[PDB]
Design a protein around this nucleic acid. Structure first.
Ligand SMILES: [Mg+2]
Lengths: 82, 98, 95, 106, 97, 87, 106, 95
DNA sequence: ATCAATATCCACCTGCAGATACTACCAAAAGTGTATTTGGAAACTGCTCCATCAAAAGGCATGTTCAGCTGATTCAGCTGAACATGCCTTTTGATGGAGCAGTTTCCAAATACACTTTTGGTAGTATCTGCAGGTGGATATTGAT
DNA sequence: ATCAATATCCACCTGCAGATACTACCAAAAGTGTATTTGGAAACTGCTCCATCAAAAGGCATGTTCAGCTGAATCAGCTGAACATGCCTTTTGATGGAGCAGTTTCCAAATACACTTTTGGTAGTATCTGCAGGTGGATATTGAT
């Protein structure tokens, strides 16, 4: 039984996020839509993280690469260095 | 045969998940998604454990925030049910799109 | 092997001055580090701009002060300018 | 030999901070008070946060501060929430908040 | 006698003012406002006249954009009349409040 | 010096017609009547914030004149970068 | 004597870019090829903007570029729009755009 | 009177290259000038931060390039990177 | 209302994952002594910026009228919440080796310094031209009928 | 549809501000040419810590049922658009005066630099314990009747 990686982000999980977010009732189209948004977020962050990697001549993405990407995408993250 | 009314568990889940701080996406699937996405920019890459956890902390944080705004957008439209149109408005206004 | 400098220690002293019976987790201490570096960069970068805007080549405590006023909210900015002004005084008033 | 920090009345490292200013390309030259000032301001803000964090750990019957406590301490303070409004505190979660219109009628 | 129906001049104005670029607030009043506010921060301040124009170019652009987001909020709630709650929501979601 | 007229209530020089025009550039077709006071409040906050910062630059430069650069730098801090006035 | 610009086949001033890289305290040292690249990149982007702006001048039957043409150019181009998403072009106005639901009839 | 410099000349050369019959108002030229200085800072800043993250005292054309890749969007970046690499290569092979 | 079903709270226990504590180097702060650099303190300019007066239009304030929008009301149908569990994907924990990081080396490339040469800025005068703002007058657009 | 009111369109036409054109002075760059310094690429390799995978774990896919939410329809009330009318205030363009940005020339004060002590702060290791879960029983909340 094969599947799309993105569908790894399961309706239960998404609904949980929504609940932390204070949401009581959820349309059924939210799940796909949420997956697209999440994808665009990760594309954007990772693209920049990986760019930091390549600049360093590395084959590993370090948590600083990520922290620095987050910073510059205005999503600054505390607790992973920097 | 006992049955809670539609909304009673949902409220309950909110109260629960607003209280806790655990990540809510299962790690492995999240981790596979990271690597699929990353493969497209550079092949044969490795990820520090923490570099993947930082992402998951970031995404989850981001998405939970978007749902707050999304929920406010539904409530503006006199609904209590969040639809994609709500997400799109929120992102539009935040300046992530359009 | 090589040294990884942090603030994770000065933080702990400050924690003890403030809450002598209280201690702190690894992660919590990580957050406090990020915080300190964040605010450090913000204040430094703003001070750096001030000094460049005025063709000055020196970041003096006046730039620090102005930067603090630009970066911090009302009361927060104000208790901070006192503390910083105080510190310079005490350091100066010391043979 | 006396540490500039002890002279200044501070736990935070005046020297280190002087160095960090020298090597961050902020300016050609750095005044002598500048790192004292800055160190003091950093210590201060650290204090205020640890103070409130502490209280939140105390309030939840705990002696060790964890990220959550920092999150509660920061987002319930108007000015710290502002200073840190575009910052994610890992493992912090969110404040309990449910919109009234979602609360059950009867 | 002749009457355009409610909305019809409104749409006319939108086309008109979206086609042009002149500042929409009167210069002199804006200047007074700027001076009042500054004066409350520091007395005896003088203003490069271009500083006042920068302020007005900036304020007007800020509000025109706020009114765009404000409008989408009205239309989201199936209205065509922007109201204070629309401004309020737009400002919240922007992170202003 | 000799006198200098007292400024008061100058926010009211942001009139209803002016506000109506800004909204039309913003695409707005119909306007609730409480918008005018709401807008005035939103604008006053925007202006105080920008000016407070701009004057902070003026003061730091030891000037008594607020320059377009003081404003341009304030706008940049505030994430409202402005082209067309130097910098 | 050849300018380094001509050496590099650029209109934009490589020397001046070098100086500014120095006086701006960006790092201790500046490799000899950085200003060259940089001045190239700026020249390219200003060619890109001028191209689309000129077009927008010609469309409005005009010979001289004004700010409104820069505004039209930047805001109709996805990528320039993004690169300049948080920038205000004085005297630029906005793009004509009326939400459909506002238009009369059905 | 002091020499206030600008990019007006470089901008006007490039304008003639792409539209040889087209002029520019002084206000528009001001806008262009702001644009160039803005992007200069943005690139130079990302470069500065980059070298610093990787403990290099030197901003080379390699750091400019990565900065560009970080700052600019897709197609613009691709083209900027070519024009850059091209101007360098040519320059290096022109002494 | 009472009453059952079930979720939540609270008191107490306890092993160990994760704090706090200790030690011992040593990188980098501090101390010392010259070697630059810098930000003024005075002492003058020419500005822009303030103030103010008068004329004029161009837009603002106001009141009236009623079109049509908003929000109240009502309702049917559709659509998401709640529901029990074993199938299966994730979690956990153990193990080779990829590559990050430590170290050392040396020259291609950087700064530094004193010449030499050029260009980009401004300021003084001069010329020009694109187009802003006015003019009918021929072509829509809207709304009453 | 047809008809009249008025907004819209566009094209040509003169005054003119704002643009382009030199001219020329020159001061500040930018360039050129040695002498001097070194940052970091390059090569070698130690040892974290990351990919892989086997067994242990528990969250999720599923299909059914109907509660209650959403969106459509209708409609009475009243808010906000349009517009005519009366005239105040902003705009425009003078003119003077001065308060003050913007320079330049000399030093005392401050900060950088090369060199040596003297710790404070880190990694690596050694004890120490806060609290994450577990259980037990009381208590609160929800929903049916
Ligand atoms: Mg006042």
């Amino acid at each position: 039984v094969l599947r799309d990686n993105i569908q790894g982000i399961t309706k239960p999980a998404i609904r949980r996020l929504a609940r932390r977010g204070g949401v009581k009732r959820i349309s059924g189209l939210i799940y796909e839509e949420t997956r697209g948004v999440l994808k665009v977020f990760l594309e954007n962050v990772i693209r920049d993280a990986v760019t930091y990697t390549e600049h360093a001549k590395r084959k590993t993405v370090t948590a600083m690469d990520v922290v620095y990407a987050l910073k510059r995408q205005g999503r600054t993250l505390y607790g992973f260095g920097g | 045969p006992h049955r809670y009314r539609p909304g009673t568990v949902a409220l309950r889940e909110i109260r629960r998940y607003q209280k806790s701080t655990e990540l809510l996406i299962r790690k492995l699937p999240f981790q596979r998604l990271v690597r699929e996405i990353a493969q497209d920019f550079k092949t044969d890459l490795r990820f520090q454990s923490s570099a993947v956890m930082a992402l998951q902390e970031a995404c989850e944080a981001y998405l939970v925030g978007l749902f707050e705004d999304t929920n406010l957008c539904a409530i503006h439209a006199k609904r209590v049910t969040i639809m994609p149109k709500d997400i799109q408005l929120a992102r539009r206004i935040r300046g992530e799109r359009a | 092997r090589s040294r990884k400098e942090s603030y994770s220690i000065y933080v702990y002293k400050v924690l003890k001055q403030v809450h002598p019976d209280t201690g702190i987790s690894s992660k919590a201490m990580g957050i406090m580090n990020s915080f300190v570096n964040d605010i450090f960069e913000r204040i430094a970068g703003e001070a750096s701009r001030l000094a460049h805007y005025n063709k000055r080549s020196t970041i003096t405590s006046r730039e620090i002060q102005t930067a603090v006023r630009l970066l911090l909210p009302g009361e927060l900015a104000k208790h901070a300018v006192s503390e910083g002004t105080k510190a310079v005084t005490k350091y100066t008033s010391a043979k | 030999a006396k540490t500039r920090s002890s002279r200044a009345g501070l736990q935070f490292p005046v020297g280190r901070v002087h160095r960090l200013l020298r090597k961050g390309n902020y300016s050609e030259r750095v005044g002598a008070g500048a790192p004292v000032y800055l160190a003091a301001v950093l210590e201060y803000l650290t204090a205020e946060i640890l103070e409130l964090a502490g209280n939140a750990a105390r309030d939840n019957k705990k002696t060790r501060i964890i990220p959550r406590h920092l999150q509660l301490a920061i987002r319930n303070d108007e000015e710290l929430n502002k200073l840190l409004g575009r910052v994610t505190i890992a493992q912090g979660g969110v404040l309990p908040n449910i919109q009234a219109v979602l609360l059950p009628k009867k």
